[PDB]
Amino acid sequence: PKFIAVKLIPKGPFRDIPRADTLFGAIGNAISAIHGQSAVEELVDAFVGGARISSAFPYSGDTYYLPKPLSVEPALEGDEEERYTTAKRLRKAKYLDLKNFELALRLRPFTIPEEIPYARVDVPRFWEEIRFREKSGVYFLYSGPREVFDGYIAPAMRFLGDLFEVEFHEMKIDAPGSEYSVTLSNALPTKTPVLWRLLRKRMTFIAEGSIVKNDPGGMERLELEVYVYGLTFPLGVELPEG
C-alpha cells in the first residue's frame, strides 16, 4: 500500500526517536492548543475509524529504514561458521532498508544496513541525546483519508516544528496479502499475539516489528482527560511453519 511519509529534518540533536504513543500524544497536545478538545475528539474518531500512524524510524538521503519483523528470527536457517555468526548479527539488527524489509516480509534472502544513520552519544556530568548523520533524520507513516491529514496531522506537525522542520512525500511498501501482519507502531494488543517483544512504560506495549493475527490494537482514555494510542499499523507478513 501507498502512505504519507512525514519527514522530520532535525534542527539540532534529538532526545528520543519517538514511537507511536508519544507521536499521537504530541499531535493530540498540538490539536488541543490550535483547535480545542472538539478537534482531539474528531482525531480519536478518525483513528478508531481506521486511520493509523507508525512509530518514527531513521532515514538517510533517499533511504527509508523500517523495523526488522520478528517473523525472520525463527526462519534464519531458511557454511557452519558463516551461518551462526551472521544469524546473530541479523538477530541483533533493529532496522532494514525498505528494499530488504519487503524481502524479509516474504521470507526471501535479504541483508542488513551496515551503517545506521544515528548514534546514541551519552555525555557525562548524566543524560543523553541522538546525533544525526548528514541529510539524515527521522520519519513516520500516515495511512487513512487526506482530509484528516490536512486538517489535523499536518498542522499539528508544523506547530511541533515551530527542534525540526517538516516535509512529506508519498511512499509505497509492497507487502504480501496474508492472515498475519507486522505493526510499524507499538500497540496495546486486544488478542494475544504471534511473535513480540514487551516494552514497559505504567503500560505494557507490544514493540514495533511484533507479529499479530487480525489485531487492530486499541486506544485507552484515563484521568490524571488523555487518550493513549496503541493501534496496530499492519503490513501482511509471510510466516515460517513452526
Binding site: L70, E73, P74, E80, E81, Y84, T85, R89, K92, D122, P124, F126, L188, P189, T190, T192, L195, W196, R197, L198, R200, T204, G242
Partner: protein
C-alpha cells in the same frame, strides 16, 4: 529401597568394574570384577544393598536364580522388578555411549590427555598435555579411597554422585585412543537415562529404544544482565547474581522432585541454562506445564518483564541419543528452535498480560555462609524466596534446614542430617576483603590501582561454544564438555586470581608485581561467561592470565573474546556493563580470539580494527613496554625528563588517524627508541593492513595511566 532408587544407583554403578580391573585386584573383566568389588564391600561394614547393586556389572537362566538367592522381599522389591532394573540399565549403558593404562583424552583437544589426578580446585589446574600411561598403582590407591568413601556414604544417588565425581572425573570411561568421555559422566548419564525409561513405564523391551519415551528439557533465562546490572553497591550486585543462581536451582530441583528424578538427570545447569533428560509420560508434560507456568507467573509478579524463564521440551527416542551416519545434535537443534520461539513469546503463559532489603542482608551475610536450605516459603529464618521454595542461609555454626541443602564449593556433605538431600553447587566467589570483614567497594578497589585511580571492568565470553557443543555425539560427551567448560569459570578463575599456575601462564602484560590478596571482585563467572571488577591495572593483567589459563585448559583449541573498561569509581554499574558489552561484542564483531584493551581513535575506512588479537597485543607489550616501563608505576628513567616523547607518538598516530594515506607521520619522526615506527612499512600496505604506528597506542596509553 524402592525400584526407582535401585534403577538410579543401578546405572550409577553398572561400570564401576573398570577402575577395579585397571587396579588388577580381581581376576576377571570389568563386569565380573565389578560384581566381586561390591559384594566384598557389601560384607565389609555389612550393608547388603551393595550385593543387590553388584548384579548390574554382570538366556537369563543363571541370573533369575542369583536374584532369587538375594531374597527380594527383604528390600520390599519383586523379583520381576529387579529383572527390569537390570535390563533397563543394560540398554541405558548402550545409549549414553583397548589397553588398561590409557588416560582420559581432553574433550577440547582429543590429541592431548589428562594426567591422573582427583578433582580438586585448590590444587593444580587440569592441562591437557603429552599422553602418559597411568600406573596400576594409582588405580589401586584410587579403588581404596573409593572403597573407604562408599563404606561411609548413605547409598542415596546424591551421596554416591559426589564421591564418584571426586575420584572418577579424570578416568577414561573406555580405554580406546582419543576417548573424550569422563567415567563419572557416563555413569550419571546411564543413571539419568535408566531412571527416565523406568518412569516412562516401559519394561522387558528389546520398544523404549525406537519409541519416543524420553524428554529433552532445555530451560533458558532471557534478560540475565537486564536483571543483575541496571541497579540504582557491589555487596548488593553480588547478591543479585547469587539470587539468580538460587531461582534457577529452585526451578530445577522442583522439576526433579515432581517428575521423581535425581540430580544425575541434570546434564548441565550453568549461566542460567539447564538441560534435563526425563520420561515422556503425560503426567510428566502436565507436571512440566504446571511448573513452567507457576514459575513464569512468579517471575512476572516479582520483577515484571525484566527476567523471563523460557522452558521447552521435545519428545525424543533412544535412537536420538546416538549417531546414524548425528541425531543427538539434530534433537538439540530442533529444541533450541522451540526456545528461540518461546523467547519471542515472553510471558505468553500469562493471559492477564494485556489488561529488595532482603538482598542487602544476604549481601551482608555473604562472607561466612556455607550454603542455603530449600524449605517451604512460610518457615522461620527464610531470607530469600524463589518461585517454589524459601531459602534459609546456612552459616558455619548453625544447623542446615529443609528437604534439600545447597552447599557451596565442596563435594563432601560435612555435618548435614542423614535424611537431607545433598546439592553441591560451585561458584567463582573470589572477592578482596576490606579492613572490615565484608567484601570491598568500587571506591576501595579503584584507590588500590598503580597510577590513575580508575575501577577496572572486564566482560569475557568463549568464542563459538554453541558450535563446539552441537559437535558432541552422545549425552555423556555433552556432559563432559558441559562440566569441564563450567568448572574452568566456576572452579579455576578463583585460583587464576590468587596467583596460581605461574608456569602455565608465564609472562603476561603487567604493571605491578602480582599481590597476595589482589584487588579483584568476581560478579558473575559460569557457563562460558564472566564479569569481573577491580583495580584497573590488576584487571588489565588478569584478562591475559585468564586467556592463557584457558588456552592451556583447552588444547589451544578454544578462544575467548574480552572487553576491558577503565571507569571513574562513581560511574553507575549499568553504564559500565553497556560499554564493556559494546567492547566485547565489538571484539567478536572484529573476528574472535581478540581483546578490547582500551578505547582508541582510528580511521573509519573499514581497514582498522579497535580490538587486538591476544597474540598481537602480547607481542606489542613484550616489544615496547620493557624499553619505556621499569615496573610498579615507575618508568625506565632514561624516559624521566622525556615522558613527552610518548605523548608525541600519540599525536603523530593521530595525524595517521586524520588520514592514513598522507605521508606526514614519516616527516615528523633518542630516535633509537621505537625503530619499527619510523619506516613506512610496505608489506602492511601490500597486505592491505594498518601501519605499525596505528597499534602502539594500546601499549603507551596503558603505561601513561600507570605512571601518572
Amino acid at each position: 529401597m524402592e525400584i526407582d532408587e535401585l534403577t538410579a544407583l543401578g546405572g550409577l554403578l553398572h561400570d564401576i568394574g573398570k577402575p577395579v580391573q585397571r587396579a588388577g585386584l580381581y581376576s576377571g573383566d570389568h563386569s565380573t570384577q565389578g560384581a566381586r568389588f561390591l559384594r566384598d564391600l557389601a560384607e565389609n561394614t555389612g550393608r547388603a544393598e551393595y550385593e543387590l547393586l553388584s548384579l548390574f556389572s554382570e538366556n537369563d537362566e543363571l541370573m533369575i536364580r542369583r536374584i532369587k538367592e538375594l531374597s527380594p522381599e527383604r528390600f520390599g522389591l519383586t523379583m520381576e522388578d529387579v529383572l527390569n532394573a537390570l535390563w533397563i540399565v543394560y540398554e541405558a549403558d548402550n545409549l549414553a555411549s583397548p589397553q588398561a593404562s590409557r588416560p582420559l583424552y581432553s574433550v577440547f583437544n582429543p590429541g592431548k590427555a589428562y594426567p591422573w589426578a582427583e578433582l580438586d580446585f585448590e590444587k593444580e589446574l587440569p592441562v591437557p598435555g603429552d599422553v602418559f600411561s597411568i600406573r596400576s598403582q594409582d588405580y589401586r590407591e584410587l579403588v581404596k579411597r573409593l572403597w573407604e568413601e562408599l563404606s561411609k556414604a548413605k547409598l542415596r544417588s546424591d551421596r554416591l554422585l559426589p564421591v564418584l565425581e571426586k575420584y572418577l572425573t579424570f578416568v577414561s570411561s573406555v580405554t580406546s585412543e582419543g576417548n573424550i568421555i569422563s567415567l563419572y559422566d557416563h555413569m550419571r548419564m546411564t543413571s539419568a537415562i535408566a531412571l527416565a525409561m523406568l518412569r516412562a513405564g516401559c519394561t522387558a523391551e528389546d520398544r523404549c529404544r525406537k519409541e519416543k519415551r524420553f524428554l529433552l528439557i532445555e530451560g533458558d533465562f532471557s534478560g540475565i544482565q537486564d536483571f543483575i546490572y541496571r541497579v540504582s553497591t557491589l555487596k548488593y550486585l553480588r547478591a543479585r547474581s547469587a539470587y539468580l543462581e538460587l531461582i534457577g536451582w529452585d526451578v530445577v530441583l522442583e522439576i526433579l522432585s515432581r517428575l521423581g528424578l535425581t540430580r544425575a538427570n541434570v546434564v548441565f545447569n550453568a549461566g542460567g541454562h539447564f538441560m534435563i533428560i526425563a520420561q515422556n509420560t503425560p503426567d510428566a508434560v502436565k507436571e512440566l506445564e504446571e511448573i513452567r507456568a507457576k514459575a513464569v507467573e512468579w517471575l512476572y509478579r516479582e520483577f515484571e518483564s525484566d527476567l523471563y524463564l523460557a522452558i521447552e521440551w521435545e519428545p525424543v527416542s533412544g535412537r536420538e541419543f546416538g549417531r546414524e551416519g548425528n541425531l543427538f545434535a539434530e534433537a538439540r537443534k530442533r529444541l533450541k528452535h522451540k526456545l528461540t520461539v518461546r523467547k519471542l513469546k515472553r510471558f505468553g503463559e500469562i493471559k492477564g498480560l494485556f489488561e529488595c532489603n532482603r538482598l542487602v542482608s544476604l549481601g551482608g551475610n555473604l562472607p561466612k555462609l556455607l550454603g542455603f536450605g530449600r524449605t517451604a516459603k512460610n518457615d522461620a529464618g527464610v531470607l530469600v524466596e524463589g518461585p517454589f521454595s524459601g531459602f534459609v542461609p546456612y552459616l558455619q555454626g548453625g544447623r542446615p534446614v529443609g528437604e534439600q541443602i545447597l552447599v557451596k564449593n565442596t563435594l563432601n556433605p560435612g555435618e548435614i542430617p542423614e535424611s537431607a538431600q545433598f546439592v553441591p553447587y560451585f561458584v567463582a566467589d573470589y572477592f578482596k576483603k576490606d579492613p572490615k570483614g565484608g567484601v570491598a567497594t568500587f571506591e576501595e578497589l579503584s584507590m588500590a590501582s598503580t597510577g590513575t585511580r580508575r575501577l577496572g571492568v572486564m566482560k569475557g565470553d568463549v568464542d563459538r561454544l554453541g558450535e563446539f557443543f552441537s559437535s558432541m555425539d552422545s549425552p555423556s560427551k555433552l556432559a563432559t564438555a558441559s562440566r569441564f567448560m563450567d568448572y574452568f569459570f566456576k572452579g579455576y578463575i578463583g585460583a587464576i586470581i590468587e596467583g596460581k599456575f605461574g608456569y602455565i601462564i608465564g609472562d603476561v602484560p603487567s604493571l605491578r608485581d602480582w599481590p597476595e590478596e589482589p584487588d579483584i571482585v568476581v560478579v558473575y563467572a559460569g557457563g562460558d561467561d564472566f564479569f569481573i571488577v577491580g583495580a584497573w591495572d590488576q584487571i588489565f593483567e588478569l584478562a591475559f592470565r585468564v586467556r592463557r589459563a584457558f588456552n592451556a585448559y583447552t588444547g589451544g583449541k578454544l578462544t575467548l573474546s574480552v572487553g576491558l573498561g577503565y571507569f571513574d569509581e562513581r560511574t553507575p554499574i549499568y553504564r559500565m556493563a553497556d560499554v564493556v558489552s559494546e567492547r566485547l561484542d565489538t571484539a567478536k564483531d572484529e573476528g574472535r580470539n581478540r581483546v578490547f584493551v582500551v578505547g582508541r581513535s582510528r580511521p573509519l575506512d573499514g581497514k582498522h580494527k579497535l580490538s587486538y588479537e591476544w597474540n598481537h597485543y602480547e607481542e606489542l607489550w613484550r616489544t615496547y613496554a620493557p624499553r619505556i616501563y621499569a615496573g610498579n608505576g615507575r618508568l625506565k628513567g632514561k624516559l624521566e625528563s622525556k615522558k613527552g616523547l610518548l605523548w608525541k607518538l600519540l599525536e603523530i598516530r593521530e595525524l595517521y588517524v586524520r588520514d592514513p594515506n598522507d605521508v606526514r607521520w614519516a616527516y615528523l619522526t633518542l630516535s633509537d627508541l621505537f625503530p619499527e615506527l619510523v619506516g613506512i612499512d610496505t608489506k602492511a600496505v601490500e597486505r592491505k593492513e594498518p601501519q605499525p604506528v596505528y597499534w602502539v597506542d594500546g601499549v603507551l596509553k596503558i603505561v601513561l595511566m600507570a605512571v601518572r
